[PDB]
Amino acid sequence: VNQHLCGSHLVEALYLVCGERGFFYTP
Amino acid sequence: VNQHLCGSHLVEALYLVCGERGFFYTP
Amino acid sequence: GIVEQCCTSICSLYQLENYCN
Amino acid sequence: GIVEQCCTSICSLYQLENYCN
């Protein structure tokens, strides 16, 4: 299992762990 | 961006958020 | 279970932590 | 930044939360 978080997968990880906090960049 | 977590991606998400807790199934 | 919650549907950090340990 | 920490290397939940908001 790849534990690196790159590109879209990094975006999903931020979706997941930032929750209602949000994160850059979601326009 | 796909927000679904399936297969290996679900394993990585558990790696990420379970941290030292661990999770099934890591033999 | 986890597949229905996080793969078929979209799950939150809190839901996903349910499945640790 | 986030790419070096989480893509090139492997990052923890705590590191990744650094980058929220």
Element (H, E) at C2: helix C2-2
Number of domains in chain A: 1
Which sign does the torsion angle of CA B4, C13, B14, C20 carry? negative
Q: Which two tokens stand for residue D20?
A: 């929220």
CA closest to B13 among chain A residues: A13
DSSP state of D9: S
Resolution (A): 1.6
Technique used by the depositors: X-ray
Angle of helix B8-18 versus helix A8-18 axis, rounded to 10: 40
Q: Is A27 exposed, middle or buried (0-12, 13-18, 19+ CB in 10 A)?
A: exposed
Contact A13 B15 (CB under 8 A): no
- Dihedral, CA atoms, B1, B4, B10, B15, nearest 10 degrees? 60
Size of interface A-B (CB pairs under 8 A): 32
Contact D12 B19 (CB under 8 A): yes
Domain of residue A25 covers 1-27
Any C CB within 8 A of B15 CB: no
